[PDB]
Amino acid sequence: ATEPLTREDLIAYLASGCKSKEKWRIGTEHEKFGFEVNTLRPMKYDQIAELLNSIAERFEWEKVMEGDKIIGLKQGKQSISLEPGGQFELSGAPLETLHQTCAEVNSHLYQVKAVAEEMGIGFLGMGFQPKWRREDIPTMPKGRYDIMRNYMPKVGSLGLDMMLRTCTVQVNLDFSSEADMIRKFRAGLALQPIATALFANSPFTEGKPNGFLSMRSHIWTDTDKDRTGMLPFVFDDSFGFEQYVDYALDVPMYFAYRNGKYVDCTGMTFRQFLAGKLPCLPGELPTYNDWENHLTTIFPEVRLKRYMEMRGADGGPWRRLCALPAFWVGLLYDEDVLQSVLDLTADWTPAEREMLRNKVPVTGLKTPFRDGLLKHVAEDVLKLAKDGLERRGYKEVGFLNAVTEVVRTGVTPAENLLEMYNGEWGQSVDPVFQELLY
Amino acid sequence: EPLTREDLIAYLASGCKSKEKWRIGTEHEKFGFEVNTLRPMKYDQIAELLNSIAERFEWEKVMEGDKIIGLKQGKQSISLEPGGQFELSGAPLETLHQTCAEVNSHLYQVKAVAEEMGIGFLGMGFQPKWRREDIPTMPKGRYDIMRNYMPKVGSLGLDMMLRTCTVQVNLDFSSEADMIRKFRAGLALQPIATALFANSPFTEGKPNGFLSMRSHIWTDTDKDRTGMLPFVFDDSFGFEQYVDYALDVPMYFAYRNGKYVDCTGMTFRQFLAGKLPCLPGELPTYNDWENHLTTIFPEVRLKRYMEMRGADGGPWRRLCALPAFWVGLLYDEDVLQSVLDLTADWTPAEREMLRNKVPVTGLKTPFRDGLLKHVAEDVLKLAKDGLERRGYKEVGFLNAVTEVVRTGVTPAENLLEMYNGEWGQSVDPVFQELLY
Ligand SMILES: CCCC[S@@](=N)(=O)CC[C@H](N)C(=O)O
Ligand SMILES: CCCC[S@@](=N)(=O)CC[C@H](N)C(=O)O
Ligand SMILES: [Mg+2]
Ligand SMILES: [Mg+2]
């Protein structure tokens, strides 16, 4: 039946994510670099397809196909997918506690290694591929990524590196109202540079130090200015679901999915789409699934759909995969901690937030901020996050042990790798493929 | 109608299932210890561990009185052995991929709680450091009855109870004929499994002169309920003959009114007639019969399924190998025949000798004009054939025993080599080496 969507419907779609506190869940996604253990070469698509087929067969996953190509797996509310450079991704189910989150991570790592060991394949938990050049990375046989690869050079010089050479750990979290959403969004944006610093894990490029602690985070500043960043309008009095929808309506599209394929709609807006005026699909009107797809092509430091996504942290070893969601659950899921965070960050200017975002990639917790170091803010933030987890009552506070020494010493994971590179590793990155081996 | 002997025979036979319904059930036990002192984990620490696991990972609590003694989730159980050994009895699973993932899930949950408590778990067949009197005892009425009985029937049964760990597998049969064949293959080959998995060379911080002290212990526990069951190889053998055997094995206890009554020195035959002094006039249920069948401890046991009992506890890759070994041998009809062919002319005296000698000499046990190693070479290739033919790509689960069979050197001998070299003649490093 033909019943066109309006902007008002798009607003209501986001708002439809509201849920009461007792239904709030924790969704965790992470990406990993696969490599051949003996050559350290990136895992190619033929090896990826064997890995996926074996996982499906052994562990009962449904195969996700694009044409005649396996590109992912599905089992209940979990998915395994591929990033543009073959980075191997788990999107976990919405879970109630971080004990469940970490068991989900462990189950995945067991299944992957159970198959990959016989194949001579290992997985690396870092934010940026430390050894190989961009043109050494295999590309995935996915139509949507072909469109994106062709567009990236038009809007930045590092977007192809984002696609091919970066890995993240992220957390998805729920809101209960527009007021709650706004508060969470503001807390999440303001504190995102702190997450980035604590999880900074990408100091190598092409076998050498790149001069950054999170090269991955820097990459996101020269990807696409239209769909990235610290979203200053979120801190405007006017902000709400409607202001986010207008933002998103004017972010240019990548594609529209019709008839089993991705149509290139670059340079066009979802506005045009709503009015049936897309030159890629002329006269065609969008569905809620089109809107959801479009929403998934926007890449700010925190993203809004029917839930909220914290996107600032580098991939890392398993204890840090469990720490990242713990960090945000502690801060955002306790009302008093959330208020404390808003209080702490209340007087930070847009230029200050933007400065932290840009400088943290280089200096981490030693980034100057006001009359001290970001480290001192991270101290306060970490104690607050542990307060939040204590009060949840589920005994989850131990999941923050993995970042306690970072905060305490002010020394990022990336600086620990640098120290090994310059010492015991004899200035080769090759030992990182054992050090950060899953 | 009171149960009769014919009902007891039919109980066992009711386990028969068609090949498409055959499953794999895996149980293993681990020693818990304090990481810093190496001391055995005490009941108060076990109770905290079980309560935390239940709460985090959604397990139902199993209580004896006001004491938590285990957990239940679906068809899986976690229980305690008499010395606090921490046991998983897994679900009936279709493939060994599922088996090993089951093992991994358990190890993760246990370690997720135990790390914060300063507790580790050791995968060995015999407690390598501590004396019998050093081992905490579990607050479980059935084990109190057993502890009091053991000294009457052997000198090492208390060590069985307090200081041993096993990995075992439960498997199904489709008919009486199939049960008989699997029982015979299981019993004949059990000393080979014992040698491959031999992992108990230390007692009280020193070499004890064995490769599997655990296996040896089972030779001086109780002669009435252990061993290689030679009657299984008689022409007469079937469900009926096993029932008679079990009816004549003395009882341990009967469970009534929320407790265990001491029925030692009494027989299930008396029970059937209502003449058990411990429960006078009472007649048995099928649950009573099950409980009784669970107090019989031969190298292979029969209930409504079959249980392979010969292998020492070990690290995780060997927990996955033990079920694979028997699945390869018993769940392929051609391999099963090839095993019965290979063992056809073994005498009762030969089988008995191998069972008693393997604990000392392992795969270097002399057998006829060579070594048990040479038989294990043939048996391993056959077990791999069976797994290849299953079509589930499970053969890799035997990689963990391939070098043992190749070199003829048991895991226990590898530990001894470390003890005599890098460890500097202390067992304390084994608590890192075989740490889960
Ligand atoms: C293909 C680009 C969109 C997918 S993403 N936003 O999940 C990529 C995350 C990137 N690999 C990172 O490390 O942030
Ligand atoms: C309490 C003794 C009967 C239970 S058992 N057969 O499961 C003990 C197994 C023992 N822990 C071993 O390693 O053989
Ligand atoms: Mg991703
Ligand atoms: Mg047991």
Side-chain angles (χ1 to χ4, degrees), chain A residues 29 31 83 89 168 170:
Chain A
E29 316 175 23
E31 313 162 335
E83 293 287 348
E89 188 186 287
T168 177
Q170 65 171 73

Side-chain angles (χ1 to χ4, degrees), chain A residues 126 196-204 211-214 314 320 360-367 373 375 405-407 409-425 436:
Chain A
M126 282 190 88
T196 304
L198 296 195
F199 292 79
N201 200 30
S202 41
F204 308 121
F212 290 80
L213 302 180
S214 180
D314 293 19
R320 269 195 262 125
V360 156
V362 180
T363 45
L365 296 183
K366 302 187 185 77
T367 300
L373 304 174
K375 182 179 84 183
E405 291 308 311
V406 172
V407 162
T409 65
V411 174
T412 56
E415 290 161 284
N416 297 142
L417 301 178
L418 253 4
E419 189 187 5
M420 291 175 247
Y421 181 82
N422 288 304
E424 38 179 290
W425 295 357
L436 292 181

Side-chain angles (χ1 to χ4, degrees), chain A residues 29 31 83-84 87 89 127 144-145 148 152 162-163 165-170 216 220 254 296-299 303 311 313-315:
Chain A
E29 316 175 23
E31 313 162 335
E83 293 287 348
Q87 308 99 302
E89 188 186 287
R144 62 191 278 157
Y145 298 161
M148 291 179 60
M152 281 302 174
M162 182 280 286
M163 292 178 74
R165 297 203 282 167
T166 59
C167 280
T168 177
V169 52
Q170 65 171 73
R216 169 187 164 277
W220 280 110
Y254 283 155
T296 307
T297 63
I298 305 175
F299 308 124
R303 185 209 260 172
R311 300 170 47 84
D314 293 19

